[PDB]
Amino acid sequence: NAKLQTTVKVNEQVSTTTKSVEVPENKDGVKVVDTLHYKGLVAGEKYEVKGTIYAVNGDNEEEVKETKTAEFTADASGQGDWDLDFGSVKNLEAGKSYVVYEEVTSKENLVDKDNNGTPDEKQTLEHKDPKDKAQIMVIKP
């Protein structure tokens, strides 16, 4: 029911579903922000987010380059955007591609998974797509 899509922004360049940003190499730092587009969350609840940047060659993810955790609050309508700011990310190398993965977990138990009338499980979302262009940056010279 709940869905998570993501959009990576590098400096002012924004990846889309049809076009990953091609970013001129700057090993001293490029600013990376990932927007989480969520739907189907519980209004006003806190959620813990863990974002990861991986070097990606095909479907195979290589090393983790960067990690960032944060706590957000779900919009009143249970759908909206969160910005996870990785800050200045170093040593993204020309000729390589990097993908952002997101993991979302409610602070509180919200799901009655055991069908006992009581929330007993956290609501969990994830977007870990190595082929999602919207979450990919390509570094160029």
Q: What's the token pair of residue 69?
A: 């955790």
CATH of the domain at 97: 2.60.40.3930
The total number of structural domains that make up the chain: 1
Tokens matching residue 21: 């940003």
Range(s) of the domain holding residue 104: 3-140
Helix/strand/coil for 14: strand
What is the rounded distance in angstroms from the CA atom of residue 55 to the CA atom of residue 62? Answer: 5
Give one DSSP letter per residue of 50-103, joined into a string.
Answer: EEEEEEEETTEEEEEEEEEEEEEE--TTS-EEEEEEEEEE--PPTT-EEEEEEE
Length of the chain: 141
Q: How was this structure determined?
A: X-ray
Helices (H) and strands (E) in the chain, counts: 0, 10
